[PDB]
Amino acid sequence: GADGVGNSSGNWHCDSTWMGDRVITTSTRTWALPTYNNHLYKQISSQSGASNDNHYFGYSTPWGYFDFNRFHCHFSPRDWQRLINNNWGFRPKRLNFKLFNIQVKEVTQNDGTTTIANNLTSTVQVFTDSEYQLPYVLGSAHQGCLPPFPADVFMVPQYGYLTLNNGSQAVGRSSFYCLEYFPSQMLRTGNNFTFSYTFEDVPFHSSYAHSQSLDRLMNPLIDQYLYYLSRTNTPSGTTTQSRLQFSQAGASDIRDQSRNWLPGPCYRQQRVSKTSADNNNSEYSWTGATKYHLNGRDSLVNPGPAMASHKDDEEKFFPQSGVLIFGKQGSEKTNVDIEKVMITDEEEIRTTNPVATEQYGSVSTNLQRGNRQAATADVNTQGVLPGMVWQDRDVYLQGPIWAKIPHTDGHFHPSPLMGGFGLKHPPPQILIKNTPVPANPSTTFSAAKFASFITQYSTGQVSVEIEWELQKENSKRWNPEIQYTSNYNKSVNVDFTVDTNGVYSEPRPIGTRYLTRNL
Amino acid sequence: GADGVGNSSGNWHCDSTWMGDRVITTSTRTWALPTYNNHLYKQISSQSGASNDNHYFGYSTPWGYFDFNRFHCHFSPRDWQRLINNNWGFRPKRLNFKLFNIQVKEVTQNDGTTTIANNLTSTVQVFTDSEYQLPYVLGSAHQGCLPPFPADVFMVPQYGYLTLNNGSQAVGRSSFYCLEYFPSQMLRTGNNFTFSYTFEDVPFHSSYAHSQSLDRLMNPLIDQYLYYLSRTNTPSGTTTQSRLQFSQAGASDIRDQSRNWLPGPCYRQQRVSKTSADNNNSEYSWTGATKYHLNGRDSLVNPGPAMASHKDDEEKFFPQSGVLIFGKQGSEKTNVDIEKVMITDEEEIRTTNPVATEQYGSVSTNLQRGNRQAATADVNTQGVLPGMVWQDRDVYLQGPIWAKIPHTDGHFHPSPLMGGFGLKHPPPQILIKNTPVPANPSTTFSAAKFASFITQYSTGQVSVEIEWELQKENSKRWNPEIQYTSNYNKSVNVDFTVDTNGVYSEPRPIGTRYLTRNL
Amino acid sequence: TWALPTYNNHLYKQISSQSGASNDNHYFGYSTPWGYFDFNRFHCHFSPRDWQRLINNNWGFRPKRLNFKLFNIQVKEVTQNDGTTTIANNLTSTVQVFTDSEYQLPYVLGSAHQGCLPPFPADVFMVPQYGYLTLNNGSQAVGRSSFYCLEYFPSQMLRTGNNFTFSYTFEDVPFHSSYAHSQS
Amino acid sequence: GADGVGNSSGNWHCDSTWMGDRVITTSTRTWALPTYNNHLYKQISSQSGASNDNHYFGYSTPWGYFDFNRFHCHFSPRDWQRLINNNWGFRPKRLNFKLFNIQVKEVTQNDGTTTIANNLTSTVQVFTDSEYQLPYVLGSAHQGCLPPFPADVFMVPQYGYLTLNNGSQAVGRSSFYCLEYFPSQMLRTGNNFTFSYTFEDVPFHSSYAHSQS
C-alpha cells in the first residue's frame, strides 16, 4: 500500500517487446467485483431427480477470482504472428501480477432510482494461496477470462468447488474449506497489491509440422537387405500347393518394408460430417459417444487423446467429440446451430498419430493349420507399446495455456489433453472479496447473526506480465514455407477488428503450427 | 566375535523412538535353526503326472535364511498409529541387523528318551551375498517372518530356488548354485555378527485418500467456453431430420464437460459376493479367472493392477483374485471357509482408478452413414495412454514391505503389485547353516563320503533396526478427519492382545490411508 | 468483524430487580454505555480440525501467551428522515478504547455469557454491553456498594486511521489433563 | 558384565554404619527364579459367579520382580534402636542396587528322579523401567520381600497387573503391556548388573510423641 485518496496507485505498463531470444508481454484491464451470496457460504448439490452421472456435491463461496489461462489475453493477433511464422517453439519462463487503483462504491435503492457514491473507508481483501491447499478450479476452461480486446471491462467470476458425493449426498471424506481462514491483505483506496511467480522447467511446445510421414523414412533408390514373406502358395498345377517364397522390399512395395517405429496410441471416436444430408437420422449423440466409466457413472471423453482428424482429402468429416470447438461472437448457450460454432481442424499430425475415426490396425485372431484358414480382427484401441512416437495437440489462440497435474502416485507423460503446459505447481489462484459492512444494529444486544449489510461493490485495474522463451528455426529447405496470411480481398469488415457497433470479434481459430520440420 | 562362554555377546535394545522427522524402530526375537536335508543338496521337480502349468525344476539347500519383509515385524499396533493418523507419507531410509548369543545343542536319541547337552566347540556360519548373485526368494510373500508379538519364538525357514524347466526336465541354461562356494563367517559360542544397509532413493508411499474425484475438478458456478455436440437431429415435422446442434456444458450436465485427464489403466476381474446365495452354482474358479499366458502355460494374476474394488454402496462384492486376503489366527492351509479369511477392502481409489469388475469405457466400432446406424463396444482392457493418472495399492500392516525389480532391459513404473517399495538393490539375503560334525569314522581308510553325523541344532537371538522418514501433512480442511479407532464397547477379549490361553492374534487388516488430501 | 451500537443513550443507569420477586432473585447494580470484547471460549481459537492435533496427539496443554489488536475502524452516522434511513461516513468521529489491566473493575468475564467471537470466521458479531452488580439488601443498596464510572480511566481515542494493540503474558498454571486413566 | 566362569562377579558388602548425621545400610540375600507361565502371557479375569465388587480383569506376565518395601529388610532389631530411641526423625536420602553371581541350572525329569546340571551358555535378562511406564505394583503390601534374617533364601515373585473392567469383561480403554518391548540387559554367567537412585525431597517421619494434648 501507499499514499492514497488523490494519488494513483499505479500506471499502465501494458506493452509487448521482443529481444530476439525471449518475449515479454504485458496487458491491463478494468474489472468490477460484485458481492456474491450475501456474504455467506452455501452448500450446493444437484437436483433431486437427475441421472446417476449428473450428481454433484459442493460449496459456493462469496469469494471471486482472477483467471488468465488463455493466450488471447496475452497476445494480440499481430504479436501472435512473430511467434507462429518465425519460431519452432515457445515456453512460459516467468510471470508478474498486480492490482492497483482500487475504489469502492456504495449504492442506495431509495425510491425508484438508485444513487451511487464513494465509500472511502471501505476495504477489499486479496490473497494468493501459493501452497496449493485449495481445490484448483483453473484449467477447467471456464468463462471469465480477461477480455481479448484491451478496451473492454469484465466481471470477476465467483469461486466454488466440489468434493466426494454419494448420489446427491455427501460422504464422510468430503472436505469443507473456509477461505476466511487464510491470511489475506486488506486493501483500502490508496493501497495496492503485487506478487511474482516462476515457472518450473517444461518442454517447448512444438509449432512445427513434419515434412515426412512415419510411413516413408527411407530412400526409394536402394533395396533393403531384409526379407519378408511375399507369396504363400505356388501354382504347381491346375491346383496350387503350399510353398513359401521370400522377397526383398524395394520402392515398388514400401508397404512391406521393415521399420523401427510405430504410430501413437488411439482410443477411437465416432465420425460425423459437416454436410447435414450425410449424417444418420437418430439420436446417437450420447449412445454413440466414446466414454470412460468411473465409479459406476459414465463421462464423455471430450478432447480425447491427440489424433489426426479428417484423414486425407476428406475435410467434410470430424470426430464426434474429438476436437475443440469455439463459438463465434454472441452465441447462445444451448442447442446452437452448425454455422455459429468454429470447429478446429487438426490435420498436421497425420504423419504420426492415427486418424481419430479409424482403427489402429489389424491383429491375428487364430492359429492357422491345414484345414483352418487364417483370420484377423481390427483393433480399435491401443495403449502404449515400446517404440511408438506421437505429437500433442495445438494450443491455438483462445484456448487454455496451462493445467495442473493431479497429485498422484503415478502419471504417464504429463502433457494435458486440451492443450498447453502441464505444471506440477502452476500459477497460484488469486482470490478477492468485498469486506462486509454492517448496517445500523439495534440498540439492545442480540447475539443473533447479522442479516443486514450495506450494499456495495468495488472496481479497479489489473495488470499481468509474462516472459516467454523462444526456440528459433534453422532449416535448409529450399522452397518457401506456408505462412499465416490475412486475405487481401475487400470486405465489409476487417478481420479481428471492431464492427460498426463497437463489438470486437475473432473470425476463425488460429493454430500454432505452420513452419515445417523433417521427421 | 569376542570373548565368550560366560560372557553375553549382546543386549536387547528393541525400542521405538520418534524424533519429529524420522522414525527409528528396533525389534528382537529368539530363533531355532534345524539341520535340513542331512547336510546335502537335492534337486527337486514336480510330480510325474501334473498339469502343464504346474511343472517346476529346482534345488533345495541345507541353508536357511532370515526374512523380515512384513511391517508387523517392525511396528506394534500402537506405533502404527502415529504413522497412519498423523502422516501423509513414509519411506525406509536405512536399516541395521545383527545376531548374538549363539548356542549350539547336541541331542542323543539313546533308548526311548532324548537328552540334550551343549556342544561348546561347534560352530555356525553366516553370510550375506549383497552382490545379488543368488536367486532372490524374498518378496514372494512366504511364511517364516519374525513373529508380530515379541515374546514368541520362531523357526528359521529352509532355502531353495527354481530355474528353467521343460516339462519336469531341466534345460541346458538352468543354473546350479552351491552356497558353500561363498565366503562366510564361522561363529562359535562367543562370536557375534553384524552388518548395515542403506536404501536407495524411493518415492514416498501415499497414505492420503483424495477428497475429489477425477470426475469433478471444477466449480459448478461457471459455464465452460468450449462446445460439445448436444443433439443429433431435430423434429422438423412429424418426421425428424438431421441437424447438428452444439451446447456449452454447465452444472446441469457435467458429464459432457471437457477434461485434461483420464482414469488409470485396467485389466478386468470377475466379480463375486460375500453372500453365499448370490453367487452362481458351478466351478468358475479356474475357468472364470483372469490369467496371463507365458510360454504355453497359464498363470493366474493374483493381485492384478491396482483398482478400486466394490464400487459404491455395494460392499457385498469383491473381485475374484483382485484383492489381498489374510487368514485369521490358526487357519488351515486348504479349502478354508469364508469367515476364517480376512478379505481386504480398497475403496479409497475410486476417485482415480476404475472399479475392478467393470469395463474401462466404450469405444466406437464403425463409421456411420445415412443408412448405417452407429455402434460401439465396451473395452475390457487398457494399456497406458498419455495423460492418465492412478494410485498404488495399500501396504497394510501384515503385508510385504518391499520387492526387488527384476534385472531387465526395460520396465514401466517399477512399483510392485502386492504393495510396498520396489528396489533395484533391496536388503540382501542373510543365510545361516549348522556346520557338519562327523561321527566316529572307521579305523581303515575309506574314501567314500560320510553318511553319519552328530545330530545337533542351534539357537540364539536376532535384532533388526530400521530408520524411516516421514512426510507431514499441512491442510486447511475445516472439518475433522476420519481416524483409526478401537471400539469402546465391552468385549470378552481386547483386540490385538493375547487370549486366555496365551495366543496373540490380529483381528482385522489395517490399511495405511485415512487422512485426506485434495486431488 | 464487529459492530458497536451506542447503548443507554450515552448515560449510566442503576438497575435493580423487580418489586415483587423471590428473596433470592434480588439484585442491585449499574449498566454502562460501554461495551466489551470477550473470547473466553476455545471454539474462537480452534477449528474442529486444529482441535484434533491437540486431543489425539497430546496429554496436556496450557495457555502461555496472547496478543490482541483492533484496526480498520470506521464510524457511520444514520439519518431517519422520512420513512427510510440513510447512512453515511463520519470521518471526524472517534472511538475510545482502554484495558484496565490493574483489575480495578468488577470482572464480568468467566460467567459464561453470550457474545463470543463467532466460531466460524465469516460471521459478523455484535459487541455486548457492560454492566455490574454490587451489595444489595432486598432491592435496595447498602452503604458499602460501589459505583464505578468508566469515564474516569485513561483511554485511547481512535479516529479512522488509528489502531490499537496490547499484549499479555499468562502466569504459570498446571497443564490440563487430556488423558483418561487405564486403571481404577 | 565382566570375565566369568571361574571368577566371581561380586563380593558381600552387607554392613551398617553410623556417621553421626546419616545412616548407611546394606544387606545381601540369595534368590531363586523359576520360569512362570511357560514363557507366555495370559489374560486373567475373576470367576464367572462372583460379587459385583469382586470382579477384575488383567494379565499375568512370565516376568518376575525384586521388591524391598519393608524396613526389616534394611534394619536388624538392634540397628532399629539407634534410630528409635536416639532420634526424632529420619528420611530416605539415597539408595543403590546390584545383582551378581548369576548361575543357571537345567533339570532333566528322566525316569523317576530328576538331575540338575549347569547350563553355562544360558542367559538372564533384567531391566528397570525408571520412566514409570508400567503399572506400579509396589506399595500394595504383597508378599515376597527379602527375608528379614540374612541367612534365608527367597523366591522371586511373579509380575501381573489389572486394568479397567466391566463385569468380568474388558472395556475399550484397557491397556496391554508387553514387557518384551522394553530394552533389557542380557546377563550370562560372568555378567553383573547395577543401578543407583536418588530420592526426591520428602518431609521427615515423626518418631516423637507429644507431651501435651
Curated annotation (Swiss-Prot), chain C:
Capsid protein self-assembles to form an icosahedral capsid with a T=1 symmetry, about 22 nm in diameter, and consisting of 60 copies of three size variants of the capsid protein VP1, VP2 and VP3 which differ in their N-terminus. The capsid encapsulates the genomic ssDNA. Binds to host cell heparan sulfate and uses host ITGA5-ITGB1 as coreceptor on the cell surface to provide virion attachment to target cell. This attachment induces virion internalization predominantly through clathrin-dependent endocytosis. It comes from the Viruses. AAV capsids serve as viral gene transfer vectors that have been shown to affect long-term gene expression and disease correction with low toxicity in animal models, and are well tolerated in human clinical trials. The N-terminus of VP1 is sequestered within the mature capsid. It contains a phospholipase A2-like region and putative nuclear localization signals. It is found in: Virion; Host nucleus, Host nucleolus. The ratio at which VP1, VP2 and VP3 proteins are synthesized in vivo is about 1:1:10, which is the same as in the mature virus particle. This is Capsid protein VP1. The lineage of its organism: Viruses, Monodnaviria, Shotokuvirae, Cossaviricota, Quintoviricetes. Belongs to the parvoviridae capsid protein family.
From Swiss-Prot, chain D:
Signal peptide: none annotated. It is found in: Virion; Host nucleus, Host nucleolus. AAV capsids serve as viral gene transfer vectors that have been shown to affect long-term gene expression and disease correction with low toxicity in animal models, and are well tolerated in human clinical trials. It comes from the Viruses. The ratio at which VP1, VP2 and VP3 proteins are synthesized in vivo is about 1:1:10, which is the same as in the mature virus particle. Belongs to the parvoviridae capsid protein family. Capsid protein self-assembles to form an icosahedral capsid with a T=1 symmetry, about 22 nm in diameter, and consisting of 60 copies of three size variants of the capsid protein VP1, VP2 and VP3 which differ in their N-terminus. The capsid encapsulates the genomic ssDNA. Binds to host cell heparan sulfate and uses host ITGA5-ITGB1 as coreceptor on the cell surface to provide virion attachment to target cell. This attachment induces virion internalization predominantly through clathrin-dependent endocytosis. The N-terminus of VP1 is sequestered within the mature capsid. It contains a phospholipase A2-like region and putative nuclear localization signals. This is Capsid protein VP1.
